[PDB]
Every structure is written in C-alpha cells, then in structure tokens.
Amino acid sequence: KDIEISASESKFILEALRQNYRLDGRSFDQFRDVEITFGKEFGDVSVKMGNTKVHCRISCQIAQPYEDRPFEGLFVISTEISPMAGSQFENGNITGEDEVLCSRIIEKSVRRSGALDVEGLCIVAGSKCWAVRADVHFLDCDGGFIDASCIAVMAGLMHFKKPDITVHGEQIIVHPVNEREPVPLGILHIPICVTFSFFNPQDTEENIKGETNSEISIIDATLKEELLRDGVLTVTLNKNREVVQVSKAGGLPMDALTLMKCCHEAYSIIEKITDQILQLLKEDSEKRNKYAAMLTSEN
Amino acid sequence: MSVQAEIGILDHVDGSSEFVSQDTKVICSVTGPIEPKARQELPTQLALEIIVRPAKGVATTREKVLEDKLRAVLTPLITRHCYPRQLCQITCQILESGEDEAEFSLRELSCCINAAFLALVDAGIALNSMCASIPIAIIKDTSDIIVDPTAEQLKISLSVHTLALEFVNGGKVVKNVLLLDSNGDFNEDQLFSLLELGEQKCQELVTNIRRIIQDNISPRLVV
Amino acid sequence: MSRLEIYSPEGLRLDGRRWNELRRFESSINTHPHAADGSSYMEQGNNKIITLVKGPKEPRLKSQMDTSKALLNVSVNITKFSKFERSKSSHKNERRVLEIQTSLVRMFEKNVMLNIYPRTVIDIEIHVLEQDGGIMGSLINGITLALIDAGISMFDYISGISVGLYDTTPLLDTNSLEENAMSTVTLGVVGKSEKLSLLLVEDKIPLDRLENVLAIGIAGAHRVRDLMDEELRKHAQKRVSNAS
Amino acid sequence: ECLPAEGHDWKAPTKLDDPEAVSKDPLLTKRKDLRDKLICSIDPPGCVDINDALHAKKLPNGNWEVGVHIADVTHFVKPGTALDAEGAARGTSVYLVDKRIDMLPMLLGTDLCSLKPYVDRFAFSVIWELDDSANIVNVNFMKSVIRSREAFSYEQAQLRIDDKTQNDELTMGMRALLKLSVKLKQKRLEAGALNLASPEVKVHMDSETSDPNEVEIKKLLATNSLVEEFMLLANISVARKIYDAFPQTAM
Amino acid sequence: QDRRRLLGPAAAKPMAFSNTESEQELSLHTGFIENCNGSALVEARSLGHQTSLISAVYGPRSIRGSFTSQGTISIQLKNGLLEKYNTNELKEVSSFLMGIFNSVVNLSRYPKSGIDIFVYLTYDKDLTNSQISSLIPHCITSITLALADAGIELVDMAGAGEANGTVVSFIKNGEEIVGFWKDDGDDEDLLECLDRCKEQYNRYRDLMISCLMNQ
Structure with a gap:
C-alpha cells in the first residue's frame, strides 16, 4: 500500500510555490469552504470541505464512573480509520503512526483541554454517570482530517441533547423521550485546530546554515500537496484568544518568528468559521422550531 | 417506495454508492481490483x-x-474467475x-x-446478475405480515426476515435465492406465503432500480 | 488551592532557583563500550536516562529495507519505578508514548545524512530511569549525545528544554511539581539557530505571552549545546593524549 | 500603588485617535465618543459614589432612544492587580447613617470613575430602543466616554419630573422613562412578582446634637421607580446577552 | 474492554462461595482426533485428585523462516475449564518440557520441519478440602503417546515419576535421568526421591506400551 508520484511531479509543485502558485486555486494562506449539514438525530452531522468528507456521532449512556475521578462522568473519542476513505490504510490500525498523529491531537484537543464539562455528566456520584461516545468516521481524504475531525466533533457536541433523569437512590427514572425533552450539553470553550504545511524549496543546509528564511507555509494541504511536505504543525485556539495546543513534532527545521506570524493569521480565519457554525446551529434549531411551529399548528 | 440512491459520490475509490431507504442511511465503498496481500491471494x-x-x-x-x-x-454475484x-x-x-442495534440487525442487512x-x-x-433485498416482519399480536416494517413494528413483530434473490432476464426471472434469513418463530405454512410477496416485491424493487441506474450513468456515459 | 509556594516575590523557586536557571547537567560518552558504539548517559537533575544507539547495520528482514537511506527506530522504556508512585500497567504500546516515538523520528529525520547510510538500520534505545519533570527536552539532549557517541554523520547540535509559565513569568527548567502546577512548553531547538525541530504545547496558553515565551528558551537552549560541547571536548582530549 | 497615576488632575483624551492615546489605549478602536450626550442622574444628596448615567432621546422612526452608561473601572482593575483583590476581599461597600466604608480607594470610585457632571469619564454604554408598548427594538453593547449635565438629589429630580416647567429635552427624556417604567412595573408584576413595602426607617440624627433621639422614616417617591425598572432591565437584557455569550460561567 | 469477544456487561461479577503410599491410576487412549496426526487421551485419579488432559500433534509443518538442519519443537499449555494456572506458571513448564524431548526426538531425520504440541489442561479435580508440580509427569507421558501416534522417530519411551513435590524423568529403564525438577520438600531426601519416582516410571512405561502394542 504505497502512493507513487513521479519526481517530475515533485519538482512541479515545488516550482509552483517558487512562483507563488498552488494547484487548488486558493491562496497559500487560504482555507477551504466548509459545508455543515445535520442529520435528523441529535449529535448527527455531515461535514464537508470540498473533497474531504467526514462524519461523526455523539451518544451517551449510563455507567458508573471510575475510582480515579469518582466525581465525574465518562467520555472518549473513537477515530478509527476505515480503508474506505483511501486505500492507504489498514483495516482499523489503531497502531499506525499517522493515526496516532490524528489521535493525540484530538485527545489533547478535547479530552485534556476539556471543552466539555465532565462533572455535568455526574448523575449520582460514584453510582451512575454518563458514558459519552464520539465515533469519528472518515469518508474520503484530501487531508485536513485532523482539522475536520476537530470541527465535526465540536460540531456534534453542540447538537447533541441528553434525555431526562430523576433520582431516588436506586430508583433512577429515565423518562420517555417524547414526554420529557432531551437536554443539551455544556461547552466551556470551542477549539479549532489548523493544519500548517511546509515546503523547503532548497536543500537541508540552506535551511540549516542558509540564514535567509525561505520556507513556504500553506493551509490545508490537498492530497497531492500533502505528500511532499517537510514539516507538520497544528495549533488550536478559541474565541477568547488563548492557545489550546501547538504541535510541531519534528520534520523540517523552522524559525520561531514565523510561527507567531503564522498563528496570528489562524485567529482571523477560525473566528469567522466559528460563528458560521453558531448561526447554523441556531438556524437549524430555528428551522426545527419553525417546523415545530409547522407541527403543532399542523397537528 | 421511499427509497433513493446515489452513485459515484466518493473520489479516490473505485465504486461508491449511497443507498437510502425509508429510515436508514448507509454508504458502501468498493476498491478493486487492486494489489492483494500475501496471506490473501487465490490462484x-x-x-x-x-x-x-x-x-x-x-x-x-x-x-x-x-x-x-x-x-x-x-460471491456468486461476482464473475470470480475474471x-x-x-x-x-x-x-x-x-x-x-x-x-x-441492540435488538435487531434486520434492515441493515437488507440495506447493505x-x-x-x-x-x-x-x-x-x-458481475453475473441482478439482485435485491427487503426486510419482512410478522407482527406478534396482529399475526399479519408487513413488507418493510418499522422498528416500533419490530417491537411487536414476532419474526424478522430478510430475503435476497437473484434476478435475470430483464431482472424478471428469479434465477436463484441468495439469502433467506429466517429469524423469530415461524412454521411451515407462513414461509411459502413469506416468499410469495417478496417474490413480487424485490422484482418491484428492481423494477424501480433498472431505471435509476441508467438515469444516473447514461449522462456519465458518452454518446 | 496549593498549600505551597510556587515562585517567591523575592525571585526564588522551590530549590531557590531563579526563573532563568538550570538544574545540574551531566552527560557522559562511551558509557557502554561492550554494548554498542553509541552509549551515552544523562543526568539533568534527577532526570536520568541511559541512551543507546545501534547501527549502521543489516536489517532483520529484507522487507524492512530501503535502497536509498537509513531507517530510524525509537524504543522508549518507561519503567514502573520511574516515578514516585509506582505505575501499575506497562507502557509498551501506550498511545501517549507512541507519539514521542513518532516525534523523535521526525525530529531526527533531518540531522542524519540519510542518503550516505543506505540499506542500513539505526536503532535508538531509551531507558528512562529517574524522572524529574521536564521530561521531553531531557530526551533530546540525550539523543544528541548518542549520535555523536558513535560519530554518525550529521549537521548540527540539537537542543531540547521544557520551559514553563507561571502567570506572567517564564520558568526555565521546570520540574514535575511545577509541571503539574502551571502551563509549560518544550522547545526542540537546533544548534545555534532560531529554527525549531520540536514544538509541543499541551497546556492552555494565552496568546500574547508566547512570542516572549519563545524568546526565552533560546538562551537556555544555546547554553545547553554549549555545555554539551566542551564536556565532549574534554573527553575528546582524553582520547588522543593517552591513545598516542 | 495600583491607582492610575494622575490623581484628581486627569481627563479623558479628546482626540480618540491620538497616537500616544493610541499608545495609551490599543483597544481604543472600540471606545466610541458619547460625550455629545445629555446625561443626568437621580442620586442621593448624601452620595458622591454615583453609579448611574442615563440619557433618553427620541428617534424619529416613532420610538425613543435609550442609552445608559455604567462606569468603566474595568479599564483599570485587572486580574493581577491587588486592588481588584481587595474588591474581592472587602467584597462591597457598606452604607450607614454615620458613615460609608467603601471597597475602592476614595479618589478612584468617587471622582475618576464616578459619572459626575461634565468630567471626562470612562463608562460602558448600552443603547436601547423600544416602542410606546415597552417592546425592545435593539440593544448595543459597547464602551464610551461621556459628558454629563448634573447629578440630582432624590428631591431635585422630583423637582424636575412633575414640575412641568423645566421642560428641556433632557427632561423630555426623563418623562419618557417613568411613562413606560409603569409598563415595566406592570409586566414584571404581572409575570408573577411581588412588591413589598418595608420602610427600614432612617434615623434622622439631629444636626445640632451628638447622640440620636429622633426617629424618622425613609420616603420612596416617584423618582425611585423611574430608574429601577431600567436597572433590573440591565440585570436581565444584558444577562440574556451574556447567557447567549457564556452559558456556563456567567454571574 | 476487549472488542473481540463477548464478555458480558462489565459491572457483573462471578458467583462466590464460602465454608458452611496411595495409588495413582490411568486410562490411556489414542487415535481420536482427525485434525492431528498424533493424539493421546489421559485420565488420572488419585486420592483427592482427578485429572484429564489432551495432547495434540501437528507435524511436520513447514517453516517459513529459513533453513535449519533439523526439526523444531513447539509446545503450548492451555487452561481448560475450571483450574486456572498462572500464565507465567505455564511457560516455565513449557520450557521444562522442551529440554527432555531434545534428548528424545531424531530431529536430524526431520530437516526444516516443525513440531506443534498443544496440551489442554482440560479438567482437574482437587477435592482435598506447587499445585502445578503435581501434574508434570503425566504431561510427558501424554506427549509421548501422541508422538508415537504421529509415528515420529523417538529414541525412548521416556517417563517421569513423582515423589512429593519432586519430578524426575528417566530413560533406559531408569538407568539414566533426562529431566530434573525439584520443589521445596526435605533436605537430602534425594535418594528416596530416586526410588518412588523410578517405580512409578517403572509402572507407567509399562502402562504406555500396553496401550499401543495391544492395539
């Protein structure tokens, strides 16, 4: 399972960056357009950026909490790749490296960051809590998965609602779904990750001892773009201007002064897209309630 | 017949289809023929x-x-010697x-x-022929039979059934049965009745389908 | 609420350190001649690492072979006695660890002159003994020994250090007590430059410090590859003066 | 060591785009200039700690124009300033017949943040429009610097409300308010509320003697229901904004 | 948990209960597994303790690794139904198993060929109101019968005898020892530990050869 590209094609794109061109039609520092569409279920969404397609799912159920944090509920994200999304991939390799490179990000992007209040999953302390689940599916790759799965999970959390609960010791009263309403969830902050994609037009030494910074960085590598890149970097931020994570794990060497200059441009990008989610969550729920207005008057 | 389908909706994959019946959305992908592994080949x-x-x-x-x-x-749908x-x-x-999914797997098996x-x-x-599958249930309390039930009807269903047929000659001749998934309580007598609608219905399904394929692909075809 | 004292208004840390100070830093070369030609030992404070390098040599299988360059394997050994509290289970496929196993590869894809070592294998063995926090940059400084410890072809020194942030104030060379106390960043710094190999942030960081925060660690990192150099050199003098 | 460095000789910069004032305030981009408003506040006589600053204009679309201004101390109290920790430590200011011990230093709250007349002060400005049926059109959350006319007494304001002689448009802004404060009084109490009456009596200590021997009462006149119905409106409409902003941490 | 199996809901637990020279004996049978080429069946029952176990042969299987001059043995011990011996407790015995047969099998007759040995510690009674050490010698016997059934070149019917936490394996009618195993016991009881092991070995090998030559 190996992608084969000519070195002639390798120089071609490398030339295009040397004349400030890229094959998609975007700018270097331009991001794709995002299509968000929900299914009928809560925590159901289809997210699409041109060629890359994803789908995720949020659910929850009853379990006991750990001994470790006996206060808090349970939550984890599955991101199992299927070779459906591209023939590179093993059947569910949870031990591949790029998978881990997809994993630990979303592990830190959600779980260690804590966008979601796990303490608001405590139904009863130590007895019964929530087990909230996030199964990420990939559909078709043009890269940006780890940015797409960044979004589509956080999209899904802002669309899921959990049903109604009443406690009497052991008499724990899960109510019928349609009499007593499902209840949405508590998001502390909304993180958005950004892939950065790096291209030395030169050898090693002109990056190493060539003092002249000459390295091109772009956003959202397409599939062919992604196969030649030299370093890998993802930052994540919010609306309140705090930096969630940064991960440059090796690759090409890279100036620090670039990275701050990189990460500022992230901010203006992610903010506009964030609010686009925020209206569409409202507007769909508005469309839910206008169709709820088109239901009770109908019934 | 609240079914609907999409063809050719992935990119890097050889065969792709979204099948949408009444409640379940399922997409399938096909990549082949491609390089087989060591432990996987057949001579x-x-x-x-x-x-x-x-x-x-x-x-x-x-x-x-x-x-x-x-x-x-x-396995018989595929012209496997090719x-x-x-x-x-x-x-x-x-x-x-x-x-x-905790209680049933019926519709998905028809769906996939x-x-x-x-x-x-x-x-x-x-390939070899044409095919179809439907889910069929029999109600516990009413003792009647519904083609393409719902999950609440599955709750009061007594027995759940999936039929897969092989269709030829304009998809009209039942060439063979592929799958009959009899589950739940049943007898002799219901079963030949249980075929006898799905004898018709899967052909009635394919009767829709024959149209749909050409409608999607003849504009993908060239003249 | 912490019942302890993070950083004094009088400028001091837990051992009394200033914000711009290091732990005791000790390396060694040719610690295991009978084992491999790369053998180097680190003490950076109580972070104690045995670092081992095998190669350049024949693979175990012809499948794992290239006709262009070398390969690089990372095997990390975190002992269950590495910490104060003894960890229960083993780590040998823990997804936390595999990340670093990915990480050091891409950090060291680009110092090794890979083309001039084709059809051969480089294996880097890690033994984490005593763990003192600052754990990430502790590793990289042990690596930079071990490649030179056999004298493998390379470009440059590569330095690593975790530097932490208590509210406004940078902390060079934190410990695990301070690591659980505040926000920290580790920097994989290359040579004398201002270019980075590793950059990793887990904790939540306000944006505005970060340029200044990044501007801190370089002077630390330059003093790192400083202290590596002479310490090798005084070893390097000890060879030929008594070889010849 | 935490108070701003001038003393009682500060004024806000008239050029809102001066480069040193831009060097003084980088976030001056969102600071608008609302010194061109007509502001007057119903205050006590025994009060130099003024919190309120209001105008009311009338838009020619058919409605009034409501703008209320609350003091921007937030430009000066910062997390990391020990004076703000004393805002946590003291918690509040107390109010006695004898005295009034206060949470903030005396120069700060009573002068340079207080919305006193014609002094250049930083506030936060919220702009409402509503019909004659008290139905809010729109709300506009921002900072400003304002300029005022006079802070009234409890009685001096009632010497401008029902007098029908002081009839400038500042007072025509006043007679907007209590006209529709009643609908705010109605629809709050029609929503299911109570209205108690407990004159916690005020000891009018005799102004020629030392120890008190007179018992007097607190009198609540028409000025009190003018201001209050828009203050609880600020306790809810802005709250209905910040719940939409922060659902999990909002006070 | 384990996504590959059906282990029930997690919060369940299994059920709990509380309190409210002798003869050994065999029943040895071959030729009853058609997957294998060598099978052997062993019943054992002794005084509080009844034991049954299965030894399975696959050979000669091909080796995808490389060239060898000769054969190679592979031995598996697996828990049956009730008794659960420890994992690391198992393979130590598997180590002790292979050493003896490497003084048994003509591997030189079998170049580049593998030996697969599956031992199923199927069911044991211990009704008695070093617990693995009491089951060692019966393994060797159970293997030898199955290895005769695959008909592989074996030098000797080698067997082990037991004397009270001690296992000693013989050849040549006991005139040499091929495998030694000792736990705690006495001190310098070795000379009696020669004897009671030897005579059981003198018993057992006769029981074995009866099982085949009479068939």
Missing part, C-alpha cells in the same frame, strides 16, 4: 475482503456475522440505524446488500 478466483462499520461503537462480533453472510451473497490473484476490498458504512450492489455498478466489475 484461481477473486479474493474478497469486506468491512462494515457500524454507526455506533466499534467493530465487534455483532458486526462480524452481518459481514459474513454478506460475504456469502456477493480476476485471478487479485483483490477487491469492499467497505460499508452504517450511518443511520433506523433499527435498534442493496447498498453494495450499486457501488459495484459504479465499480463496473464483471
């Missing part, structure tokens, strides 16, 4: 490996059998349940066959 026929992802949870044993019965059905020492990985995604049949048409591989 004569075509090797097939099939992956079904659920909507919820991960791949476990509940998935495994729905895979494996679906292995049995495709691709020696080769491999076609086929992959299915359950996106919507439309049925209680009806899903994977069309992505092979996208794939354009040497």
